Amino acid sequence: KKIRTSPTFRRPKTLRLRRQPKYPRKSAPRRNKLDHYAIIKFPLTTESAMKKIEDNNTLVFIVDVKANKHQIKQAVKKLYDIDVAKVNTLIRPDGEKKAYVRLAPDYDALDVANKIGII
Amino acid sequence: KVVNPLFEKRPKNFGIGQDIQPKRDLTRFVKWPRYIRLQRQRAILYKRLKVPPAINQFTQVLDRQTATQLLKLAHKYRPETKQEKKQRLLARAEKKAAGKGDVPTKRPPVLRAGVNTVTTLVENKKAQLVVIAHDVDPIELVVFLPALCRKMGVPYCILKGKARLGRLVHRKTCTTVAFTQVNSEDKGALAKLVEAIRTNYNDRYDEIRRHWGGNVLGPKSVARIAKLEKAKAKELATKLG
Amino acid sequence: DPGRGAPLAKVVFRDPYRFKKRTELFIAAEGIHTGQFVYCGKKAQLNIG
Amino acid sequence: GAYKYIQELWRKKQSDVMRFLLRVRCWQYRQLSALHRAPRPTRPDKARRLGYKAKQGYVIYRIRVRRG
Amino acid sequence: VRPKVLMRLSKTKKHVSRAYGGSMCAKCVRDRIKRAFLIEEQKIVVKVLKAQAQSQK
RNA sequence: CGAAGGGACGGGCGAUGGCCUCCGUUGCCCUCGGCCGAUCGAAAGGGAGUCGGGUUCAGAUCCCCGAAUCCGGAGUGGCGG
RNA sequence: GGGCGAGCCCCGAGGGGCUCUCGCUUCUGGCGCCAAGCGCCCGGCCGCGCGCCGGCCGGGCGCGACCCGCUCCGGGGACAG
C-alpha cells in the first residue's frame, strides 16, 4: 500500500542516540587559567599614558594576550568595581596586549588611579 | 435541497503535453542500492544458468500441508531450553541423597542440529528421518547428504527455510534435523510420514539426479520469442492446413 | 559560444512530471528566431528547428 | 562428520557442480568493493584447518587482487 | 541601488502597485492579458468544432 | 562503480519549564524536500554600513567633541500610527 | 478495456473476427504542481429517540491515475577488452 514516489533511493532517517558515558574521560574539569587576575598584569606609569588619564578619563593596562574585550571589561569591574563605557585594545610590537579602558563620565579617572598606586 | 451548483468537476488530463503527471508508483524504476541490486539479480542467475541437479534438488521442496505434521511431531521432541538445563540439573541435584536415587534411568530422545552430528549417525544407520534446509548460503555444506541418505536407506526431506528449521532448536539457523529415536506412541505417527517422503525423494532418486534446472529467459525475452512463434504460425497455418 | 563557430539556441521546456521549467542548450538551426515554438518528440511535425 | 566431504568436494574444482559455484561466487564478489568484511566463512572447513574458530572476536575479510 | 541596499527600502519603493508589479514592464504585462485571453477563447472555439465532429461522426 | 538529506511546514501522541490558561522545549509517527557535492582558494575580483573639526615628540575615517548610518535581538512585544 | 477512430465481412443497425491508430497537446514569446468529483468507513456536539435519522465540526481509504511480471532503459555482446 506504500509506494515509492521518487525514483531515487535515499538513506532512511535512522534513530541515533546521544552520549551516556559510563565514566567521564577526564577526571575533573580544568580550572580557568584565564581568570580576572591573570588577565590584568600591571598598568602603565608612562607620561604618554599619564596624559591620557585626566584628559580622556581612561586607564591603561597591560593585558594577557589570550584575552577578549568582553573579559577585559568584566575584569576591571570585578577588581576595582568601576563601570566601563567602552574598552579599547591593541597589541604592542613586543608580544603583549595593551588596553585603553574608557570609563563612564560619572567616575573620575585620577581619583581611582590613586587607589591603583599609579600617579 | 442538498446539492450546491458551485461544485464543478475540473478534471485533470494526464496526457502527453497536457496537465502534469500525478504521483504514481515507480517501484520498477527505483535506483536501488548495490546490495539490493546484487541479490535481486543473483536469484535471476539461479534461473538463467544451467544449475546442476545436485543443487537443483533443493528447488524441489516438500509441499505445504505435509510440513505442518512434520513440525507438529517434532514440536514435542525439541531440544531443551536454557535455564531448563538448570531446571533439569537442579531437579536431579537433590535426588542424589533425598529419595535413594542415582538417576541412571533414562534420557528422553531429542533431535540433532549440526551437520557433523547428523552425518555420523546416518553412516551408522542410527537415523530414521532427516530434514534439510534448502536456503543455506554456502550450499556446499549440504550437497552429499541428499545423495548419501539414499544409499544408506535413510529418508530425507527438504524444507523451506533455515529460520523455521532453526526454530525447532533455540537458535537462529539450523541446516539439518535428524530423527534418531521417538516414543512408542509416536512411532506410528512417524511411520506414516516416512513412506510419504520416501516416495517423493528416495524412491524416485533417479529422476532428481538427472534433472537439470534453469534455462528460463526473461519475460521480456520469452514473449519476444513467443511473438516470433505466433507470427510464424500466423504466416503458415492457413496456406496448407 | 566562444571558441565555437555556431550560435546556440536557448530553448526552455516544461518538465511533464514536476513543476519547473527546464533550460536546454540547443544548437540553433538556420532560421531559428526567438519566441518560435520548438517541438521535441516522435509525434512532432517536420520543419526547420 | 560432514567436514571430510566438504574438503573432498572442494578438491574436484573441475567438476561441473563446482564450476557453477565458482562462477556464481566470482560474479558476486566482483560487484562488491575491493575490501569488505564477510560475516561467515565461505569455506568453513578450510578456515578451521588454518586456525579459525567460530567464537567471538574471529573476524574475516575478503580482498580482490588484480591478476598479473 | 545596490542589491543589498534593498533590505532597508520600503515595500512601495521596490515595486509598483499593479499585477506583475516591479518585475514586469507595463507594455508586456497587459499584452499577456490579451495573449492568454485569446488562447482561452480559441480553445473554446476548437472544442466546439471538436464537439460537432463527435455528434456528426 | 555511492543507502551521499540529520534539514523544514502542518498535524497526532507524551512530558517538563515560567503565573503547566497560554507560550516554549525535546523524542517518535505521518508529510515535504534534490540540486551537484566535503573543504581551500583574491588585504587590486563581489561584498550592508562614518564623516567634519580638534588633539600627540612620535597614532588617529581608530583618541575627544559633534553629527549620522548598517546588521542582529526582543518573550511579556517598548510606545504610537 | 475505451472511443472520434480507416473500414471490410456476418448483421438483428444492439453488436462479434481482421490490419493499424491513441491512453485524448501545432496558430499566437500567457497559465498549469502541492487533486476536483465519486464511493465506502471513523470520531466529537445538538435535537428526534426506533437509530447506518438530520444539522455542525474534524479525519482515513480506493477509483480518479487498468492488471501481472525477472533484469532501470536502450545499444553491442562470446567478439571488444
3-state SS, D13-24, equals: CCCHHHHHHHHH
Binary contact (D2, B42; C-beta < 8 A): no
3-state secondary structure of D36: strand
User: What angle, rounded to 10 degrees, do the helices at A69-80 and A109-116 form?
Assistant: 70
Place of cell 546442476: B52
CB atoms within 10 A of CB A63: 25
Q: Resolution to 1 decimal, in Å? A: 3.1
User: In angstroms, what CA-CA distances link E2 with C12, E8, E9?
Assistant: 30, 11, 11
B164 close to B71: Cβ distance less than 8 angstroms: yes
Interchain CB contact of B143 with D (< 8 Å): yes
Strand G and C17 CB separated by under 7 Å: no
- Find, in chain C, the residue whose alpha carbon is nearest to that of B14: C16
B182 close to B109: Cβ distance less than 8 angstroms: yes
Give the distance, in angstroms, between residue B74 CA and nucleotide F15 C1'. Answer: 50
Rounded to whole angstroms, the Cα distance separating B69 from B190 reads: 9
DSSP assignment letter at A8: B
Strand G and B106 CB separated by under 7 Å: no
CB atoms within 10 A of CB C26: 13
Interchain CB contact of B91 with D (< 8 Å): no
Which experimental method was this entry solved with? cryo-EM
The residues close to strand F, meaning Cβ under 7 A, are: A 5-6, 8-16, 47-48, 56, 86, 88, 100, 102; B 23, 33-35; C 18; E 2, 4-5, 7-8
**Which alpha helices (H) appear in chain A, and where do they start and end?**
47-56, 69-80, 109-116
D41 close to D52: Cβ distance less than 8 angstroms: yes
User: What angle, rounded to 10 degrees, do the helices at D3-10 and D16-30 form?
Assistant: 80
CB atoms within 10 A of CB B176: 26
Length of chain E: 57
**Which alpha helices (H) appear in E1-57, and where do they start and end?**
26-56
